[PDB]
């Protein structure tokens, strides 16, 4: 309704932050691998866990924005 605007705005913000976390993790990991190629496969687990957990915190951040907003 009227609130739709506000939720969309914070969701865009959070997506931008997560997108940045992604670009950074990938850039660093690619350079690490550039220097040490035997990492290419084994590092994936640590990359994936990090990005998954960060993803969830971002997701959680949005939920607790919704719940707080709808309190009145």
């Amino acid at each position: 309704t009227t609130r739709s605007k506000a939720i969309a705005s914070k969701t865009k913000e959070i997506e931008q932050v997560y997108r940045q976390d992604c670009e950074t993790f990938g850039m660093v990991v690619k350079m690490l691998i550039e220097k040490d190629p035997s990492l290419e496969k084994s590092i994936q687990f640590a990359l994936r866990q990090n990005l998954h957990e960060i993803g969830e915190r971002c997701v959680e951040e949005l939920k607790h924005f919704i719940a707080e907003y709808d309190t009145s």
Binding site: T1, S4, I7, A8, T11, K12, I14, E15, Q16, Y18, R19, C22, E23, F25, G26, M27, V29, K30, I33, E40, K41, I43, Q44, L47, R48, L51, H52, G55, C58, V59, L62, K63, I66
Partner: protein
């Protein structure tokens, strides 16, 4: 050698779909438009200090 890119993009997709499930569920709202990520244009102080010294050296030589 696209494994890292494929990984990061896959994480971003899973994330944005979970974002959409939340938005739809509670409640309504519209389509996000953040572009998908892209990859192109312990103690670290020792490297900072090392750089600072090489550069001061250069500066001095320059005069």
């Amino acid at each position: 050698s696209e494994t890292t890119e494929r990984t990061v993009l896959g994480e971003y997709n899973l994330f944005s779909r979970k974002i959409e499930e939340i938005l739809k569920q509670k409640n309504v709202s519209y389509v996000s438009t953040v572009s998908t990520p892209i990859f192109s244009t312990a103690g670290v102080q020792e490297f900072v200090d090392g750089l600072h010294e090489k550069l001061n050296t250069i500066i001095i030589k320059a005069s």
